[PDB]
Amino acid sequence: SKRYGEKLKEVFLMLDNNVVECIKEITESSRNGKLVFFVGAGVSTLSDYPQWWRLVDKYHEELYGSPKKGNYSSDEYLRIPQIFYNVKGEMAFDGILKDFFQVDKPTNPIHDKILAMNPAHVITTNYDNLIDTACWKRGKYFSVISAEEDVANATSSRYLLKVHGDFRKGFKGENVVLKEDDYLNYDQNYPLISNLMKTIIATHTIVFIGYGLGDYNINMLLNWVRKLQKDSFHKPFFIRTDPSPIENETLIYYENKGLRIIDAASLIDSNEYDYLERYSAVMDLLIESQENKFITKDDEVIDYIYGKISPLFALQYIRKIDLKHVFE
C-alpha cells in the first residue's frame, strides 16, 4: 500500500516531460468535465470476462470438429463467426453466445479508477455490463446506449455508449457487432450511434484504454480522424498497456497519426502477464495527479492555489464557507 504510493511518487518524478504534459492535460480535462474514456476489451479481460478468441475457438470446433492448428489472424476473428452464422444456424450462434456470455463477473479496480476520473461520457466496444455495474455502484448514472432507439430517448446528458451493442435485450447476435457482416454493415446499421461517438470524440478529450495500437476500432477511428481538417481537433490520448515498451518508430508513427500515447511499459517495470499492474500504474498516475499527491515543492503550491483563487479576484469578498467549495 504505502510502498506503492512512494513508488508512484518516484515514477512521476522521473517521468518524461511529454508524459507529464499528457497527464496534466488529462487531469485538466477531467476537472473541466470534458474527459471521456474509450474503454476496450483489455479492461473487461481484467475482470476475467470471456475473450472473443474463446468464442472463435468454439465456433471453429462446431464448424469442423477440431480446434485450429495455428493462430487466428485478424480476419479469422470475424470470418469464422460469419461462417458459423451462414453454414450453421442463427439459433446455434445465439445459443453459443448465450452460454459463453451469460455469466456474472465483478468490476475490476480499473473500472473504479475510470469512474473516479469523472468521465463526462464512457464509450466502449465491450458488450458486457461491467461498466454499467460500476457506474450504478459508484452513484453516477449513465444513459446506456447500445441500440439505435436508445439515442433518441436518452435520459441524462451523459452516456455509456456501447458502439458494438450489448446483451441487455437478449444474448442474441443481432444485438451485437461480432461477425464480419456486422462490421461491414456497421455504418448502415448504426448511423446514430456512430454519429454520437464521432461527436463525443470531436467535442471532448478522449483517452483510449484497453486497446492495442493495432486494434481495428482504433485504426478505424484514426482513418476517420485523417479526414478532419488539420489542427481542428484535439489529439486523443492512448493508454498503452502492452508488456513491452513501445518502439520509437511505432510511437512516432501513431503520434503523427493523431494519438498521444502514454505507454505503461515505459513508465514502470512489470511482468509480461502483469496487465493489471500496468493499467493501475497509468490510472493511478492520473488519479494521484488529480489528488495532488505529486506536488513536491514550493512555487507549485503557489500555482495550484493561484489557479483556484485568481478567478475570485474579480469578487470583492468571498465567504469562508465559499472557500471550502473553492478547494473542493
Place this chain on the structure above:
Amino acid sequence: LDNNVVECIKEITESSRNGKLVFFVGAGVSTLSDYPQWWRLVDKYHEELYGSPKKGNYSSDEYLRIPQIFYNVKGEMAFDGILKDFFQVDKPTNPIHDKILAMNPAHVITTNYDNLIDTACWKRGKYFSVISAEEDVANATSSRYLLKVHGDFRKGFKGENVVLKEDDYLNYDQNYPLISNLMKTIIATHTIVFIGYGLGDYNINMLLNWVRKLQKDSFHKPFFIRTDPSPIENETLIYYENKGLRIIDAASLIDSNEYDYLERYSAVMDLLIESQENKFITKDDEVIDYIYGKISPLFALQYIRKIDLKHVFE
C-alpha cells in the same frame, strides 16, 4: 385549432420545458430583417460575367452555378468583393428572433451566414457557443451551440468562410465533417423545429435524405413551421409527413395577405410561446390525466408532505 396542431404544440412546449428543443433557422427569418437575399447576389454575379440580368427565372441549380461560374472565371477576389459590398450591412433583429430565443432552445442550428441570431442572443443576454468553422467544434466554450452549418463572415467577407457556390455544397461533407456530424447528432438527440424554410429547400431535403437512412422509429420526427402564403396541399402534407416531418402550417392557422410573412411567422411563434403556460385542459378526463401524471410517481412514497405538494404542481 386542429387536434394534430395542438399535439405538435404540446410536444414542442414540453421539449422547450425539458431543455431539449432546438430551432433550425432558415433564410426566411433573416429576410424578415430585410437581409440581402441570395438571388440578389446571383443577380449581381449574372450582371457581372454575362453583362445583363437573366431574362427568365433562376432555377434551383442556377443559384449555385452562377456564383460558381463567377468564381471560376472572375476569381476569388471579385467574388469576395461582391460578397463584402452586398453583405457588409447592419440589419436589425426581427421579433421572430426574440420569439425563437424566448422558447429557450437548447441549441440553434442555422443555415444563415449573417450575425442576426448572434445579435439577438447578445441582446437577450443568451450566451451561445457560436460554431461556424471546423476549429470551433473542439474549441466550443459551452454545451449550447449556435451552429452555423454554412459558416459566416465573422472571420471575414470571403467565400472560403461560407457555403454559397455549388462547389461548397458538393464538398460540404468533406469540408465540414465535424460540423455536419454535430448537426446530425443534435438532430438525433433533440426535438427539432424548422423555421424559415420552404419545404423544398436543399437543406431540408438533404436532412430528409439522411433521415430515410435511419432505423425505423429510432428518431423523433422534426417539426416544420411552414409560413407560405397559400395553405399546404393535402398531398404535399401527406408526402412530407411520411418523409418524417411534422408540419405546422401558418396559412392553415390564420388568414393573412400573400406578403404578410411577418404575421404568419408571428402567429406560430406566439402560439408556441403563449402555450408554454398553457396546459391544454378543457374536459374532465384531461384534468384526471394531468393530475395523475403529476402524482403517480409519488405513489412509490408512503407519505408526502403537504408543503411539498406546491412543488409538485409548480
Place this chain on the structure above:
Amino acid sequence: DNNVVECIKEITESSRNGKLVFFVGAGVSTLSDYPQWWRLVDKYHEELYGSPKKGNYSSDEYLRIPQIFYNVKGEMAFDGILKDFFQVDKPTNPIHDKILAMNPAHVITTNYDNLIDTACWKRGKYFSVISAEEDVANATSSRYLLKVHGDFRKGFKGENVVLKEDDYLNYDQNYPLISNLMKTIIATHTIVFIGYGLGDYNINMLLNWVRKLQKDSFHKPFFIRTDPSPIENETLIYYENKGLRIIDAASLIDSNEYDYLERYSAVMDLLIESQ
C-alpha cells in the same frame, strides 16, 4: 472557327477505328415528338392537385412530383399514366440515322424509348441493348446500346425506368453494373453528347465524376449544344474547364428559335460529310 475544326477531326478520327460513342439525350427523342417528361409531370401534378401547375417547374419538381404521386397514389396508378402516355408509336427523326451513320462503337442513352432500337434494327447494325441489371452479363455482342435509365420492353412500369426522385437517389445501388459499364465506356472512348443541355442533371453528374478522375487521364467529351441562343463566352470556358469540348450549333449556323431539327442536323451531317 479554328477550334471547331479539330473537334470534327477528332470525332471523325475516333469514328474510323470504331472508337466513337454517342451519348443520346431527350432532345433527340423530342425531335420525333416523343412525349416529353414535363407533360408527364403535368399529368401527375393534375391528378395530385386537380389543377395545372400555373407556373414554372423547377428541376426538383420534375423528380419530386412523380415521387409524390407514386407515394400517395400508388404504383398501379403511376404505371397507368406511364402506360397511356408512353405506349405510342413514334417515327425516327433523321438525327437517329445520322448518329448511326457515324458507326459509333456504343450508344449510351438516358431515353427509355425504343427510338434508337428501331433505328438500329432498320439499319441492320445489331447492338446489344442493355437497360436492366440482368442484361449486363448476358450480352451477346460487344457493341452496346446502353439505356442507363431503363426502358419499357419488360413493361410500362415505373420500376423498369428511372423517373422519380427515389430512382435518381438510389441509382447507384439499383444500377451498379449499368453505371459501371457507362463509366468504362466513357473512359476508354470518345464521347459525343447530343440531346442534352449544359444544365442537364445527367451532364453535370458525369461532370462531377470527371473531376474525381486524375487530370489528363481521360479524353474530354464532346458536347453538341443545340440551344437556340448562342453560347456565352463565360459559360463556354467554364464548361470547357470542366472537361467538355462544346460544339455549339447556334454559333455554327443561323436559324430560328423553334427549329431544332436542323440545329442537330447542322452538326450531325457536318460530322458525316467529313467522314
Place this chain on the structure above:
Amino acid sequence: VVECIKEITESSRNGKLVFFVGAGVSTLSDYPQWWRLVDKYHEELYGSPKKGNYSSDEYLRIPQIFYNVKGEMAFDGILKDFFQVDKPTNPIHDKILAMNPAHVITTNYDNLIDTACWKRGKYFSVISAEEDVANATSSRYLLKVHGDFRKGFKGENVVLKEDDYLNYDQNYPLISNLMKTIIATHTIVFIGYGLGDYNINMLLNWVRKLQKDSFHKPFFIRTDPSPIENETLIYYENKGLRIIDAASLIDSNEYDYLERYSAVMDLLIESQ
C-alpha cells in the same frame, strides 16, 4: 466440379474468358513475395525481424510505418533492391495464356505475365496507371490493378502500403471501374489466390452489392495443400465463388505447388 470445367471451356471458345491472376502464380516463378519485403522494412525499422507471423494488417502497416518515418526515397530504394530482378515464367503462365483469355487481370506488379504474353506473340494492352486506360490501343487488356514498375521502381506506381489500399478508389477510379466492368461482362477464373485474400474479399463485398443472378459467378482455383473443409465450401459458394480444388482432385505433397496448379490448368486445356 465437372460442370465447372464445362463452363470454362464454353466461355473460352466464345472468347469471354478472363483470368484473375494473383501472387501465387508469381510466387510459383520464384518472384520475391511481399512478406520478405515486409521483413526488410521491419528489419530497417526496429533493427531485427519480428518473431511472430505477420498479420494481414502488418503486411500493410509496416510498409506504411516505414514510408512515414523513413521517407519515400528509402521506401523506393528497398523496392529496387528486391524487385529489380529477372525471373523465369513458370509453365502455368503458359497454361493461363493457352486458354486464350479475353483479358488478364493481375494484382501482380511484375512483368512475368507481360513477358509471358510477349513470348507467345499475343498483344495485350498493358494498363497499370490511370493514363493507360484512355491510351489503350486494343480491346483486350492486361489490367494490372495494383500498378507495376514499368514507369520505375517507385512506391507511387504500385499499391503496396496501407495508404494505397485505403485511397485505392480515389487514386484508381478508372482502373477499378475497368476491373469491375470486365468481371461483369466476362466469366472470371481466379488463379494464384487464397480464399482469405484481401482482394478476393474486396470483390466478394462488391459482388454482394449486385442484385441476385445479375452476374456470372466467378470461378476460383484453390491450390492450398489441405483439401477445402466442407463447411468452408458452402460459405464461399454462396458468397458467389464456384471453387475448384487441386487438393481434392489429386493427392499432393504439402510444398508441391506446381503440380496442384498444373493439375487443374492442364485439366482445363485437355477439356478444350
